[PDB]
Amino acid sequence: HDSHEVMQRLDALLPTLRERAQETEDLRRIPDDSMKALQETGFFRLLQPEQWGGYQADPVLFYSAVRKIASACGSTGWVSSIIGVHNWHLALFSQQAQEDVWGNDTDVRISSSYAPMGAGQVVDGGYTVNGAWAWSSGCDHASWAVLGGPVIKDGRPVDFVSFLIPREDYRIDDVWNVVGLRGTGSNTVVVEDVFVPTHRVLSFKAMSNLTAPGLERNTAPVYKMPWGTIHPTTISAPIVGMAYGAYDAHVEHQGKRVDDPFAKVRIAEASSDIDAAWRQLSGNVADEYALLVAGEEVPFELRLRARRDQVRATGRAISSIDKLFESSGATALANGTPLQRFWRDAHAGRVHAANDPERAYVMYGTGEFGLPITDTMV
Amino acid sequence: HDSHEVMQRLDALLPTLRERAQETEDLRRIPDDSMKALQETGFFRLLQPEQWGGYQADPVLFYSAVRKIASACGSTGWVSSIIGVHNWHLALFSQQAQEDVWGNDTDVRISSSYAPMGAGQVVDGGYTVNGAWAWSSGCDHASWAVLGGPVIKDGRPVDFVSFLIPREDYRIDDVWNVVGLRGTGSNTVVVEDVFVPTHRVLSFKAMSNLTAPGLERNTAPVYKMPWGTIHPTTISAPIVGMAYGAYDAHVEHQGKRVRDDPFAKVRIAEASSDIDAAWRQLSGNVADEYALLVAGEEVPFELRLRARRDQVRATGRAISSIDKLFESSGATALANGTPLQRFWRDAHAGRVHAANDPERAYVMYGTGEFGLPITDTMV
Amino acid sequence: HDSHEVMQRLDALLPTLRERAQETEDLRRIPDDSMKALQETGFFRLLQPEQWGGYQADPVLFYSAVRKIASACGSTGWVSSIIGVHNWHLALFSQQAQEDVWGNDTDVRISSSYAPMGAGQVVDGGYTVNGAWAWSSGCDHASWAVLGGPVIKDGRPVDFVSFLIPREDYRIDDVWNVVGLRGTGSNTVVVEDVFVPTHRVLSFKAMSNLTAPGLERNTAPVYKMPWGTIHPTTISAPIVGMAYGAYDAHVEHQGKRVRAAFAGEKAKDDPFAKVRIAEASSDIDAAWRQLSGNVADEYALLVAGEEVPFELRLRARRDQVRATGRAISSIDKLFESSGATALANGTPLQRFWRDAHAGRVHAANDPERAYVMYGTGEFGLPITDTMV
Amino acid sequence: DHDSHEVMQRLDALLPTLRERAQETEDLRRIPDDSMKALQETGFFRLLQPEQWGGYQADPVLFYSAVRKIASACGSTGWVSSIIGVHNWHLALFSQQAQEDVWGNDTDVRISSSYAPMGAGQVVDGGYTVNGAWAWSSGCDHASWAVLGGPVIKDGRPVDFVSFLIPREDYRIDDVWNVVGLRGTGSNTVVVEDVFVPTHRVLSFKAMSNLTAPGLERNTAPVYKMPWGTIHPTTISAPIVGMAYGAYDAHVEHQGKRVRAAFAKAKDDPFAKVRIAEASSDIDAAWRQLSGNVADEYALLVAGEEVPFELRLRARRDQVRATGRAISSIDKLFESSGATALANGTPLQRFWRDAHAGRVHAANDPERAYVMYGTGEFGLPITDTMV
User: Fold this and answer.
1) Could you name the CATH architecture of B109-203?
2) Among B245, B261, C283, D30, which is most buried by a count of CB atoms within 10 Å?
3) C: neighbours with 3+ CB pairs under 8 Å?
4) Which parts of the sequence bind FMN (chain D)?
5) Do B263 and A358 touch (CB under 8 A)?
């Protein structure tokens, strides 16, 4: 994938992203000029359908792009992954929803908050939505949001969906005050008595049934990938990328500085484990995609292995960054320097629901025993 | 130890230290109020000689006090431990040096920087000292510094000593800009062509030979404790304390949330057990050394080796436990201004101290087990 | 505690135990002469009541003795611990049951199997017991067994008790065929349609309620210790002792190698081998400090006429399963470091390694069981697990 | 795919028998004759043998995949298979005349080894005088030649490190194998006393690493240009990875039955499930890196390109680590299984002992590889030849 025009353009941009990393942290928001430059590489177009001028790319290319960006700036990589994957999600909505978003401008971005921090009440022609959806990474750089929650009919939940809402109908509250991923501006999308029409709503069950309405026109194999791989991989990929960036920064600084065999061992351990994380994370995605391209269903056993290795990829990345940070010692404490930033950033990314390791591990083991699984994050 | 008057007074202070932990980080040094409150508890007097109004206390009492303070505020616990132990170090200097410092005011504090970031050239009546000694925790709150470095004679190092220098003779550079232990104000003490008289310089070899001049008047057994246990334990005790604080904060917060996740329960079992193990060994080795001294017996080298082995490991267990708790807590723990992420950053910052390097102690311990020569003096 | 007469006599015996370790494995049984020598030290009397000529000792002394024995021979240490603790358990049974066992010979030994592998049906005068109780360590060396199981009444289980049964009423089946603790002879006690009188049955609930009938005459504070600490610590202490033995064997062998090595040899300056030794010794010591520490704290409270608080019983279980874990992790580090030399059959370190991993399987070593319970306690949620 | 290769299909048919006979193999303290004959029949030993001798001169990933498969059924048989099989690669680098000495009448002849220096050869006219007692020669009872590692002695000093190729008529095998794991490997001692070894039967490891080994003239297949530093240590890690796959399958089979038969501990034990997740993921990571590094090296050679030193360093890094991941994973499964797993004669405790025995091999020492890798990352000089 390194030869792809998008990858080559991203390569040219990395020094800019590194130089801006502290400013990004300080301002608690990705700089507009970084997002513009990322847009210009074609990055956001990677998972966007061909009908909207997108690449509808091999998903490994997308995650490889994310890994690269995150290796320069953890917050920019995190935002890039999440915002970029929403272009995949929107491909599954109705054609009319896609036209609402992209009909005049195919570079329009969408942010998200998928945890149920609000709900939609059934009304004529759609839903009345209320909520305060926290943790919307990069939400200032989007003009729509996809927001997860139950549909309420006659007082009971009857579906679990994403509501697509334009920014004219919501307020962003600046609350992002955290120890890591400070640059992500993961602020809160506040929705008050908002009408959302039916065509702008997509059930996660329709997605997993392979009946999402977007599939009729967006026929590319990438859109048949399971959400339980696509979304959690978008969360792990940037953390793996952070580990690459941390590794390179550490070895560069230490190389110059260098009879300590222990520092060498930590470097060996970290580099091996980062590589293992990437091999599994990208490998499971490649295997799923190969089956789809061959017209096959992705076997449930593969979806389970994907989740198993994906949470573990995050853990390997964090363990590896921890080793390097610890080994670096006093010099790494200095504010403004890359290694301590990757460290705080990776630990912040770790909190995402999709990174909880026992959730995935317990499910995987349940499958190995042929016992029923009700968890939908797969 | 919990019933000691100093410990009871420190208990009364903890809520305040907790409340003020963020403002302490933001100030990048300990607030004046906190140092004054700590002083008024008698804490700094714990290891100070009785001749100066001190308690010359059981060293376990001192480290228990540090553990308690650090459980409320990591930066304050770190500074308290380091500044407090300098009162023990000064007890070993000449009577005249102790008089210079405490002769008019027995509450005077001393900061340090023991890494060789400067040196003293031999001259008539003393030394000419030059250096820029970084990482002097709490230096803004002291009016003297003890500074480690070689004595230079005929262009060769001939001793390794601490130079005791009053604040009138040095400049403090505000450079403290770090990810953790932010409130410690571990600034840089800059010394330029300063005369230090002979009586204000103490060799670490005299100390380890049990010939420090201060022993003649300060006869309490605590002053015969080995530096290789006293100094490194100073650096581990606050980190263990941070882990106790991190644990209490996490269980309080989580308990409320919980009132079926067996994994969160397992992490708290692992963390509480490992913190307790760290404290049992750290305090146990100190207690064992001290018991021998109280009995008029020598501290055997094997015990000094065990102390170093377990002390670096105590720091490791404390950090590993904090990591577990912080991980387990998840999203709620990222918020700026909340205790758990602060303890996490603070513990990882304390980890960088030379006396916490674990392989250094482990390799020495192993060398000892094989009956091979040891030249490392940090023991 | 090493000035105690029992400890001094055990010290004198250790070389014999070490020399016999391979034979003990090969025969799958503790040698009769080892059990006799152990008896002659006074070891089995340590937790036995004063009325029967016993020491009714500080429990830390008992576990210290166990630690010592197990450091010489893992199987002998394992058997010694479990058989020794049965003398504590019997102190809680009725006076009449103790008289049945010790009335003519206060050196009689009892084996056990506390997992429910049989049951007792209520009948006039007691119970009809049926079972096949596996894993009865050292059962050949005992003339009674205490066997854990439910009482059946109206064809429902109504209590969980130990049935005290003499050897004339059971058969031992030799089935012990395992990868470690081979010497323990942990065979199966088979009980067929046997009458067990009321006075020879003791409920664990009665024990926990401090209403066990033996407490009336056996008033020493050690008998008020909680089973949830006493029995699991009897399982961890020998594994900790195995770790001490493994450590000493490793350092003795390696020390000779390194001192005999030449200037440029790997063995002369291997910092990694040194680090593994530091890690192992520290973690073994931590295991012992907590395991013995929690026992000491419980006992001190009892000596002071106080109850043992539940929070302490929870900490005891937490640290006890962890002590087993620390001991095994440490042996693993040493065995791995030793490398090719350690593979040789008949040598001590690989034996301690297999032995510790075998001891690990005991129900009382399952770490998540204790950890989850401890965490439940910290959250102020209800606990129903009785192994505490 | 490798799984469709004729040798792999034939090995598949043999696995149940190898599993069944694992205990009798340990008890015999060497591989049974039947097993070696069956393995020979599959074509397995021919995998890395040159085509001029009827061999497959195969993609080395195919060879290590075969080893993984065999080792998943029987740790000792997989260990011997890997080692004996790789000697057919090593012999391909010796002179044509040496290969002719070994295979000129019977191309099924096997060679054992002991590469650690446990002997030496003194320079004499026409060759060397060799003396040694080379321990740990896995499967030596099943070979009629040995390749023995040691220095060459010239004017009383060691001038080169070579392998001496010696026929069985010239050495004695001492039955000494008495160990806690890999019991079935029969890793006995090859004793050599005042033996003449001609020049054409001696191969310098430096000649190999310089790409000047004489066997390369006729044996031109790209597999023979692979670096020894990857080839030999991978032969030591691959069977341990296979043992972990076998341990995993045995454990999940046994446990799955238990759990599905359980009623309202085995019914809902999330910890057992986590150990399964951890072990499976780490075993997979081990194999991906171990096989991936070999694949990347081989792809370069197939393309007529050089294998960069950086890749050789990564290979050693991941290879020692693969052994560690395999052992850690087996440990997890054995611990989780608990009491049931202690029974003698059952598979999981055997894989556990076997993996811990394989761990002692020089090529598995992990700090050795890790320190070397770190030295390379700093751009500092490396003198270690195991790369």
Assistant:
1) Beta Barrel (2.40)
2) B245
3) A, B, D
4) 79, 113-115, 136-138, 258, 339-340, 361-362
5) yes
